[PDB]
Structure formats: structure tokens, C-alpha cells
């Protein structure tokens, strides 16, 4: 496959909505390469609308564990967890193309049933939102209150805007 | 496969509604062919009814990055985002057959909910319509005021009307 080819050169590709299925696949890849050579860097290209919070954390956690620096490239759209992963990349190695987009908002969910049940789902989602926000601040350089107000509602941004916010370090031109 | 033989000789195919999947495949193939020989050119054959604006921008952005000059050939139809990319080919290397059809229009989308939410959507939608029109006008040579008015509703153009408008550079006869 065209992807197996790009893999012989250390390049993983995340280009679909994030569900458990995707998460696992991208995790086994980052592991396979780190084993081939704990020195040569790896590169992860991103184009996604976000998805499961738990699913992206799996990915976000393997990028940290492995020795090899992981660099990111925004191609098309990097929204929600997807934009989260982009910022998660190695300092100085976070890229975006000229016409890419970046969208950051707050966690979505649901609840149905007894007062007490609706309460349980509510406490959890608030907690996640909080965890996700504190890391966003450390990656961007933005203070918490900002990453808190700026995510209240859908917040789309252009590549020049992402660079300013600190989600990426450079724009690949030609 | 018939399409496999196509890549082996540097010919990429784009024959379907543009979505995040078709988009990622096309991007990789471009980067692959640039690896084997940054000097020889690559051809992008087109026949698509359009698709996602973000899916389309990635394709466009990658054509601009690689060193090989990328030619484009409209075959059958090239509507919406399809005609855009078509116009994104190397100057002097954009084609189309005698009976090909090309169409341009404005972005499409939707919004539901609170007044505040429909606003966020209206702003993003109108913004993409703006970025698309400005690149179209740099590629065609046409003034922006014209692109804007000419795209208020579906605009179907013959291959001759395509050549004259600046969407292509030469018609292939025999």
C-alpha cells in the first residue's frame, strides 16, 4: 500500500475521525518504528475532525513514551482532539501547510435518565475539559483563563493564526 | 491494477467526489513520486463533481510544495472544488478535452441552534468563500469582482469557455 511505502521512511498518517480503531493503529505504528531505531525521528501527518477523548489520549501518550522525537504536520484540518495532537508534537517540529485550518472548542457529550445519573456524566465531562485545557496551555504558552474562554464555542483559526497562538512552530512553504 | 500502472508512469487519478479519504491518498502519492525523481513531472487527471473545501485545500497545498511540476487534465467534468484544483495546475500545463465541462459556484453548508451558533457558522462559511475566490483570481488572471458575481449560482462552462476564462491553458484534440 502507498502507506506501507511511506512507513519505510518513518511517516505515520492520521487522516480520519478518531475512534478506538484508529487510535490503536497509530499506537502500534509509533511503537514499531521506535524499535527499528531509537534515534531517527518520526513524522505524523494530520487531517481530522476530532473524535473520542479517550482515543486521542492513547495516541498522545505514546508520542511521549518513545525515544524518537515526533514531529507533526497539519494537512487540511486539525480540529478538536486532532488539533490537540498537532500541538502535542515536539517543540520546534510542529508544522502546518499554507491553507490548513485549526479548530479548538470544548468536549461534547450526553446524558439520559435519573437526576443522579445525569449528574455522573456531567462531572466527568467537566473534568476532562479541565485536563485537556491545562495541557493546551503548556503547549501553546497561553495562560489557562485564555484557553478557557477561547474554547467556550467553536473557534476556527488559519495557519497564520495557529502560528500566533503557538499551536505550531512553522509553516512549510516551498 | 489499471490505476497502479498509472502511478508507475507518474499519472495520478482524481475521479470522484472529494472527501478526506481521496484527499489523503492523493497527497501521499504526490510526495512519493517527488521522492523517486524531483526532476520529472507528474500529471493529475480530473473528473470530479466537487466535495469538501478542506479536503480540497490539502491537495492544492501539496501540489505547490513538491519540486516536480504538476500538470492537470480535466476529463468529463470538473465541478466546484474539482474545477479549482484543475486551475491549480502548472501554468502552461493545464488541459481539458474538447467536450469537457467545468463549473464554479459558491460554498455550501448548514447551521442549526442558537443565534450565536448560527453566527459562528455564517462567519466561517463566508470566509472560505473569500479565500477560494482570491486564489481563483490569481490563477485565472480574472479580477476578484468578477469571480464573486460569476459564482452567485451554478455556472457551467464549455471547454472553450474554460480556456477563455483562464481556468485552463490548452485543449487536447489529436
Amino acid at each position: 500500500d502507498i502507506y506501507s511505502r511511506l512507513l519505510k521512511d518513518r511517516i505515520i498518517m492520521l487522516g480520519s475521525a478518531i475512534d478506538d480503531n484508529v487510535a490503536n493503529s497509530i499506537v502500534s505504528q509509533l511503537l514499531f518504528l521506535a524499535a527499528e531505531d531509537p534515534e531517527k525521528e518520526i513524522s505524523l501527518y494530520i487531517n481530522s475532525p476530532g473524535g473520542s477523548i479517550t482515543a486521542g489520549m492513547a495516541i498522545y501518550d505514546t508520542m511521549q513514551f518513545i525515544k524518537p522525537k515526533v514531529s507533526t504536520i497539519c494537512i487540511g484540518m486539525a480540529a478538536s482532539m486532532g488539533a490537540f495532537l498537532l500541538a502535542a508534537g515536539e517543540k520546534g517540529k510542529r508544522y502546518a501547510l499554507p491553507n490548513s485550518e485549526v479548530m479548538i472548542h470544548q468536549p461534547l457529550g450526553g446524558a439520559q435518565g435519573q437526576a443522579t445519573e445525569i449528574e455522573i456524566a456531567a462531572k466527568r465531562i467537566l473534568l476532562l475539559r479541565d485536563k485537556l485545557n491545562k495541557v493546551l496551555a503548556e503547549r501553546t504558552g497561553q495562560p489557562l483563563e485564555v484557553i478557557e474562554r477561547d474554547t467556550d464555542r467553536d473557534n476556527f483559526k488559519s495557519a497564520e493564526e495557529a502560528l500566533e497562538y503557538g499551536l505550531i512552530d512553522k509553516i512549510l512553504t516551498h | 491494477d489499471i490505476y497502479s500502472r498509472l502511478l508507475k508512469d507518474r499519472i495520478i487519478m482524481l475521479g470522484s467526489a472529494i472527501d478526506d479519504n481521496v484527499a489523503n491518498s492523493i497527497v501521499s502519492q504526490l510526495l512519493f513520486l517527488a521522492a523517486e525523481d524531483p526532476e520529472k513531472e507528474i500529471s493529475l487527471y480530473i473528473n470530479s463533481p466537487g466535495g469538501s473545501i478542506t479536503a480540497g485545500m490539502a491537495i492544492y497545498d501539496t501540489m505547490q510544495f513538491i519540486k516536480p511540476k504538476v500538470s492537470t487534465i480535466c476529463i468529463g467534468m470538473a465541478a466546484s472544488m474539482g474545477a479549482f484544483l484543475l486551475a491549480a495546475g502548472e501554468k502552461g500545463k493545464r488541459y481539458a478535452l474538447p467536450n469537457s465541462e467545468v463549473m464554479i459556484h459558491q460554498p455550501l453548508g448548514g447551521a442549526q441552534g442558537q443565534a450565536t451558533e448560527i453566527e459562528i457558522a455564517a462567519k466561517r462559511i463566508l470566509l472560505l468563500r473569500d479565500k477560494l475566490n482570491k486564489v481563483l483570481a490569481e490563477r485565472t488572471g480574472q479580477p476578484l469582482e468578477v469571480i464573486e458575481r460569476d459564482t452567485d449560482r451554478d455556472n457551467f462552462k464549455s471547454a472553450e469557455e474554460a480556456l477563455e476564462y483562464g481556468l485552463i491553458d490548452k485543449i487536447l484534440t489529436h
Binding site: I73, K93, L172 | L31
Partner: peptide
């Protein structure tokens, strides 16, 4: 996407 990613 090189020079330099790879």
C-alpha cells in the same frame, strides 16, 4: 514533506 519533515 522534505527539506525537513523528513
Amino acid at each position: 514533506f522534505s527539506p525537513x519533515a523528513p
